[PDB]
Design an enzyme around this catalytic site. Structure first.
Site, PDB file in Angstrom:
ATOM      1  N   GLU A  35       0.701  -1.254   0.112  1.00 43.47           N
ATOM      2  CA  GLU A  35       0.280   0.132  -0.090  1.00 43.47           C
ATOM      3  C   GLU A  35       1.030   1.056   0.059  1.00 43.47           C
ATOM      4  O   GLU A  35       0.506   2.192  -0.711  1.00 43.47           O
ATOM      5  CB  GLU A  35      -0.715  -0.069   1.357  1.00 43.47           C
ATOM      6  CG  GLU A  35      -2.058  -1.027   1.272  1.00 43.47           C
ATOM      7  CD  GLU A  35      -3.217  -0.841  -0.040  1.00 43.47           C
ATOM      8  OE1 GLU A  35      -3.042   0.129  -0.601  1.00 43.47           O
ATOM      9  OE2 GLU A  35      -4.064  -1.812  -0.088  1.00 43.47           O
ATOM     10  N   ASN A  46      -7.700   8.956  -5.873  1.00 45.35           N
ATOM     11  CA  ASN A  46      -8.410   7.803  -6.547  1.00 45.35           C
ATOM     12  C   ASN A  46      -9.176   8.495  -7.815  1.00 45.35           C
ATOM     13  O   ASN A  46      -9.475   9.562  -7.732  1.00 45.35           O
ATOM     14  CB  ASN A  46      -9.424   7.143  -5.611  1.00 45.35           C
ATOM     15  CG  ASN A  46      -8.765   6.353  -4.608  1.00 45.35           C
ATOM     16  OD1 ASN A  46      -8.957   6.487  -3.400  1.00 45.35           O
ATOM     17  ND2 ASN A  46      -7.484   5.661  -4.815  1.00 45.35           N
ATOM     18  N   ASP A  48     -12.129   8.324  -8.259  1.00 45.47           N
ATOM     19  CA  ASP A  48     -13.352   8.910  -7.981  1.00 45.47           C
ATOM     20  C   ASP A  48     -13.217  10.310  -7.209  1.00 45.47           C
ATOM     21  O   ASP A  48     -14.479  10.873  -6.850  1.00 45.47           O
ATOM     22  CB  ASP A  48     -14.331   7.746  -7.222  1.00 45.47           C
ATOM     23  CG  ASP A  48     -13.574   7.526  -5.913  1.00 45.47           C
ATOM     24  OD1 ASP A  48     -12.484   8.174  -5.454  1.00 45.47           O
ATOM     25  OD2 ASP A  48     -14.200   6.729  -5.560  1.00 45.47           O
ATOM     26  N   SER A  50     -11.623  10.621  -4.266  1.00 48.35           N
ATOM     27  CA  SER A  50     -11.215  10.299  -3.016  1.00 48.35           C
ATOM     28  C   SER A  50      -9.689  10.295  -2.950  1.00 48.35           C
ATOM     29  O   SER A  50      -9.136  10.015  -4.041  1.00 48.35           O
ATOM     30  CB  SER A  50     -11.969   8.888  -2.643  1.00 48.35           C
ATOM     31  OG  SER A  50     -11.445   7.744  -3.070  1.00 48.35           O
ATOM     32  N   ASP A  52      -6.324   8.149  -0.620  1.00 45.71           N
ATOM     33  CA  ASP A  52      -5.893   7.127   0.427  1.00 45.71           C
ATOM     34  C   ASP A  52      -4.998   7.684   1.025  1.00 45.71           C
ATOM     35  O   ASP A  52      -3.779   8.452   0.201  1.00 45.71           O
ATOM     36  CB  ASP A  52      -5.547   6.016  -0.461  1.00 45.71           C
ATOM     37  CG  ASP A  52      -6.560   5.090  -0.991  1.00 45.71           C
ATOM     38  OD1 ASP A  52      -7.927   5.401  -0.995  1.00 45.71           O
ATOM     39  OD2 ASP A  52      -6.168   4.170  -1.845  1.00 45.71           O
ATOM     40  N   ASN A  59      -9.028   5.076   2.708  1.00 41.21           N
ATOM     41  CA  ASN A  59      -9.815   5.890   1.774  1.00 41.21           C
ATOM     42  C   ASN A  59     -10.693   6.888   2.380  1.00 41.21           C
ATOM     43  O   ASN A  59     -11.494   6.680   3.414  1.00 41.21           O
ATOM     44  CB  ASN A  59     -10.522   4.734   0.856  1.00 41.21           C
ATOM     45  CG  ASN A  59     -10.830   5.510  -0.451  1.00 41.21           C
ATOM     46  OD1 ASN A  59     -11.227   4.662  -1.367  1.00 41.21           O
ATOM     47  ND2 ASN A  59     -11.157   6.558  -0.529  1.00 41.21           N
TER      48      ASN A  59
END
Ligand SMILES: [Cl-]
Ligand SMILES: [Cl-]
Ligand SMILES: [Cl-]
Ligand SMILES: [Cl-]
Ligand SMILES: [Cl-]
Ligand SMILES: [Cl-]
Ligand SMILES: [Cl-]
Ligand SMILES: [Cl-]
Ligand code: NA
Length: 129
Positions: A35, A46, A48, A50, A52, A59
């Site tokens: 990660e 992201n 969309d 959002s 992380d 998220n």
């Protein structure tokens, strides 16, 4: 902070992640490796909108507030910035909520794609724990 492998294993264990929801410590170390490469300051946007955050790439769509993710929730009740600290407490506490949500560690797509089913014990091999 960029953790070493065993250094992170030790911190995760100290914070009670080892075997949390039945996931051995190597699963958690493996997930953090892919990660964030063990970097607490990692952030990634992201598609969309959002973002992380942190060692476990938590998220903003569901778990933390960053003030720029429309329609999202903040189920860990923390600013996403708290997830970037050198101290992993906030990330661990929030990860415990995520992994309890129903789908276990599958919530972390990198865990499902890169750690699940593999010899995750290798991640803690040699570590003084
Ligand atoms: Cl490594
Ligand atoms: Cl393990
Ligand atoms: Cl928001
Ligand atoms: Cl922005
Ligand atoms: Cl919320
Ligand atoms: Cl906030
Ligand atoms: Cl820590
Ligand atoms: Cl599970
Ligand atoms: Na949010």
């Amino acid at each position: 902070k960029v953790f070493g492998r065993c250094e992170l294993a030790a911190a995760m264990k100290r914070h009670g992640l080892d075997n949390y929801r039945g996931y051995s410590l190597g699963n958690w170390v493996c997930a953090a490796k892919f990660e964030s490469n063990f970097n607490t300051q990692a952030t990634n946007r992201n598609t969309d909108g959002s973002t992380d955050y942190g060692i476990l790439q938590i998220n903003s769509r569901w778990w933390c507030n960053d003030g720029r993710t429309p329609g999202s929730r903040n189920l860990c009740n923390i600013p996403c910035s708290a997830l970037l600290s050198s101290d992993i407490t906030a990330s661990v506490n929030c990860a415990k909520k995520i992994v309890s949500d129903g789908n276990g560690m599958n919530a972390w797509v990198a865990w499902r794609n890169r750690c699940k089913g593999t010899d995750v014990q290798a991640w803690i091999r040699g570590c003084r724990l």
